[PDB]
Amino acid sequence: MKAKEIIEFIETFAPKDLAIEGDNIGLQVGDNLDKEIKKLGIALDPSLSVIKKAEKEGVDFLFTHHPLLKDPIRNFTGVIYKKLKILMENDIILYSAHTNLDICKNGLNDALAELYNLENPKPLYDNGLGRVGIFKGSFEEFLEITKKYIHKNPIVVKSKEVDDNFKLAVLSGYGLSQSSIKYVAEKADVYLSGDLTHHSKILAEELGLVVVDATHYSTEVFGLKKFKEFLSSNLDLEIISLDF
Amino acid sequence: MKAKEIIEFIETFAPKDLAIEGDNIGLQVGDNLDKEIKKLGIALDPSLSVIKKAEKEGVDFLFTHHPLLKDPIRNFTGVIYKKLKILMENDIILYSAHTNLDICKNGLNDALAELYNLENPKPLYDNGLGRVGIFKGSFEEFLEITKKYIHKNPIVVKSKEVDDNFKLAVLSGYGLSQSSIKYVAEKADVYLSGDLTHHSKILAEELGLVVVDATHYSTEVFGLKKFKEFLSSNLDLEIISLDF
Amino acid sequence: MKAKEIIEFIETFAPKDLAIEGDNIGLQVGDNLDKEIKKLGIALDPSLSVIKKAEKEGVDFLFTHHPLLKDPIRNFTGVIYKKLKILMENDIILYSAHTNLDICKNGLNDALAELYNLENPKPLYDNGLGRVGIFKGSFEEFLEITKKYIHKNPIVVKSKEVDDNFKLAVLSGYGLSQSSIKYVAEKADVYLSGDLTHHSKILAEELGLVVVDATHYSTEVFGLKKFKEFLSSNLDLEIISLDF
């Protein structure tokens, strides 16, 4: 469809300047835009498996949530060498929307907000990430929606009894670090995100913040599935999932 | 009246230590604070026009909201040379109360909060700037007050619906940078401030924050007018505005 | 009971990672943690008086809220010499739980929250410190509770009329710096803490925050008494308070 034109469409949904400080968003690996494309792949992470499987299926435009490299390099060996080899031989464009996709209207965090039908939801953090608002319902109803739609067996740190109509906070991905938990404990009764260390569990219990670990995977793939749908039913392309 | 004493009065209303980190407040240019003062000028800005006009109208004490220099210098040429020449040649004192006037009780942000009759108003930012509270009324009633008392045709970024009794955030001056907007969006449904950039507009629509740009000038001058009157009523001394 | 066991108990109640960045918590002075402890002393502060008193009374394990040193040294003279000499000659162990005892469930801040029976209390600051919630009652009832259970004559900065069912912020210790006040003013109608500076007073008046200074001693010692009793109840040793 011309890569240039797909990218411009994605940057219309998720403007690049929504990305948090130092987020490596946009064109990752690629020369020759203007080239038309057939199979557009979509994955969470540009792991080698995902890059291999994209060549195997003749994907010529890989879209990932997570950037290829977080930190810059000037030597190319080991794993990064193979990933680039496959991508450069096969002329497969690799593009990324990371936090700009987590932050935009109807992005990964809005999707969680909508799922739980949060009342008057606002961004959680100063950088635009996450969403917080009232869950009009009970904690048990919150748990059912979560078990149904996000993750079947979520770790629940029930640090406090939860009244109906509590403030629910959600963060798609890794959101349960010690400092994240302290911050959100000021602003919410229940916090739904991924990756609960043992220390964070204890911290949550001490502060009285109820935490639900739905894993970083399930909370990201929920909104990513949605973005895939929005893509294929807006573009005449043919679009595959590579790690769902 | 005498210069020492006008300053003392101004600092009683707006104590210097209210000023945010790094703000150049207080005496800008002047050598003899015992100098009796016959005419006092007030301006938003110590512009060359304001300064020329001050000298031409025989102003011997010039008060400005904005300081002469944000960033220190060690060479004097061009515009700053011309400004200092006029102030020094005519022994016009130049004095500023900047953010301390924005932050103090009845100062520039209180003036806005009071206008909109905000319910249980509180400071917006960690540094004391801005006010946020509940506007007991409809979005419509709010716009009308804006158009009538602040600025006739404000650009409105109406990202989605605003219910009555919404959280209204106000900031006198330049309040619509990207980081400000991300921050206020956590705290308010509506944001009234000045100087909106195209990128900030997009950000507000993405985040769901309703923004009303009334210009930095209009939002500052409203409170400056109040500060002028308050000075008139308490001081026997001719007082003119040079800037508005 | 061995020293490492008492320490392990304390750290169960107040885990070390609860402490704010840079806080010097844990073993202050001591070498032999297998030491059988017969007499536990407890104090707000490892002052020279307290360390002398502890030796006079055969204390072999000294717990203090405040650390011995906040900033590191590499020279040993004056007061710090006299302190360490006593601790070392008598192999008295000195151990501290500082902000971790402030932040933990039923720690110093929670004790305040519980006393005023705050409605849905939450941590006040990003780092876990302080509690804030609704005081179900009048400003007057709130003062009677203060006067009776914390400090007899608290200084009150009545910056504003306070309605019933106000948002009350509590911070055990020194919470009344200018930056703390600007911040709490965003979040509360009334701030109960200790050690009010003159500039902080004016600042609170300007912003409309009602401040009650019950001193840093009285707000800390209240929770410390609870933790003493708790240490008595659980551990079997005799426990004397050297500071209160």
**Domain co-membership, B211 together with B222:** no
Q: How far apart are CA B176 and CA B195, in angstroms?
A: 6
Choose among A235, A221, A234: nearest CA to A64.
A221
Q: How far apart are CA B216 and CA B171, in angstroms?
A: 9
Q: How far apart are CA B239 and CA B40, in angstroms?
A: 5
**Domain co-membership, B234 together with B182:** no
**Domain co-membership, C125 together with C176:** yes
SS3 label, residue C230: helix
Neighbours of C102 (CB within 10 A): 27
Name the resolution in angstroms.
2.5
Token pair listed for C222: 């209240």
> From B126, which residue of chain C is nearest by alpha-carbon distance?
C183
Choose among C151, C152, C155: nearest CA to C197.
C155
**Domain co-membership, C45 together with C81:** yes
Q: At what angle do helices C216-234 and C108-115 cross, to 10 degrees?
A: 100
**Domain co-membership, C140 together with C151:** yes
Asked if A69 and A24 count as a contact pair (C-beta separation under 8 A), the reply is: yes
Choose among C220, C164, C213: nearest CA to C193.
C213
Phi-psi region of B205 (alpha: psi -120 to 50; beta: other; left: phi over 0): alpha
Neighbours of C88 (CB within 10 A): 12
Q: How far apart are CA B209 and CA B124, in angstroms?
A: 15
Asked if A113 and A170 count as a contact pair (C-beta separation under 8 A), the reply is: yes
Token pair listed for A124: 């959680």
**Beta strands across the sheet bearing A155-157:** A119-123, A131-134, A167-174, A190-194, A210-213, A155-157
What angle is formed at CA A15 by the lines to CA A9 and CA A21, rounded to 5 degrees? 145
- Distances in Å between the Cα of B173 and the Cα atoms of B65, B221, B225, C1, C140 are 11, 9, 14, 65, 39
Helix, strand, coil percent content, chain C, rounded in steps of 5? 40, 20, 40
Residues 6+ positions from A6 with CB-CB distance below 8 Å: A37, A40, A61, A235, A237
User: Does the beta-carbon distance from B179 to A126 stay under 8 Å?
Assistant: yes
Asked if B212 and B154 count as a contact pair (C-beta separation under 8 A), the reply is: yes
Asked if A40 and A59 count as a contact pair (C-beta separation under 8 A), the reply is: yes
A205: which chain C residues are within 8 Å (Cβ-Cβ)?
A: 105
Residue B122: which of C185, C202, C205 has the nearest Cβ? C185
Choose among C122, B187, C131, C127: nearest CA to A191.
C122
> From C132, which residue of chain A is nearest by alpha-carbon distance?
A186
Q: How far apart are CA A135 and CA A165, in angstroms?
A: 5
Neighbours of A226 (CB within 10 A): 17
**Domain co-membership, A222 together with A177:** no
A126: which chain B residues are within 8 Å (Cβ-Cβ)?
A: 179, 182-183, 186
B95 φ, ψ (degrees, to nearest 5): -135, 140
- Distances in Å between the Cα of C122 and the Cα atoms of A39, A160, A202, B124, B240 are 50, 12, 16, 20, 50
C173 φ, ψ (degrees, to nearest 5): 105, -145
Asked if B116 and B168 count as a contact pair (C-beta separation under 8 A), the reply is: yes
Please give the full DSSP string across A176-190, using - where no structure is assigned: -SHHHHHHHHTT-SE
Chain A touched by B191 (CB under 8 Å): no
Q: How far is CA B185 from the centre of its chain?
A: 22
- Number of folded domains that form chain C: 2
Exposure string of A93-106, with b = 16+ CB inside 10 Å and e = fewer, is bbbbbbbbbbbbbb
**Domain co-membership, C90 together with C106:** no
**Domain co-membership, B65 together with B86:** yes
Q: How far apart are CA B108 and CA B18, in angstroms?
A: 13
Q: How far apart are CA B178 and CA B219, in angstroms?
A: 19
Domain limits at C179?
Answer: 99-215
**Domain co-membership, C88 together with C3:** yes
A83 φ, ψ (degrees, to nearest 5): -60, -40
Chain C touched by B126 (CB under 8 Å): yes
**Domain co-membership, B174 together with B93:** no
User: Does the beta-carbon distance from A123 to B179 stay under 8 Å?
Assistant: no
**Domain co-membership, C103 together with C180:** yes
H/E stretch holding A211 reads strand A210-213
Token pair listed for B105: 């009780």
Alpha helices in B76-215 (DSSP H): 78-89, 99-103, 108-115, 139-145, 178-184, 198-207
**Domain co-membership, C222 together with C178:** no
B121: which chain C residues are within 8 Å (Cβ-Cβ)?
A: 208
Chain B touched by A121 (CB under 8 Å): yes
Token pair listed for B136: 């007991």
Residue B81: give its domain's CATH number.
Answer: 3.40.1390.30
Exposure string of A35-48, with b = 16+ CB inside 10 Å and e = fewer, is eebebbbbbbbbbe
Q: How far apart are CA A91 and CA A106, in angstroms?
A: 31
> From A21, which residue of chain B is nearest by alpha-carbon distance?
B179
C207: which chain B residues are within 8 Å (Cβ-Cβ)?
A: 103, 105, 123, 128
> From A104, which residue of chain B is nearest by alpha-carbon distance?
B206
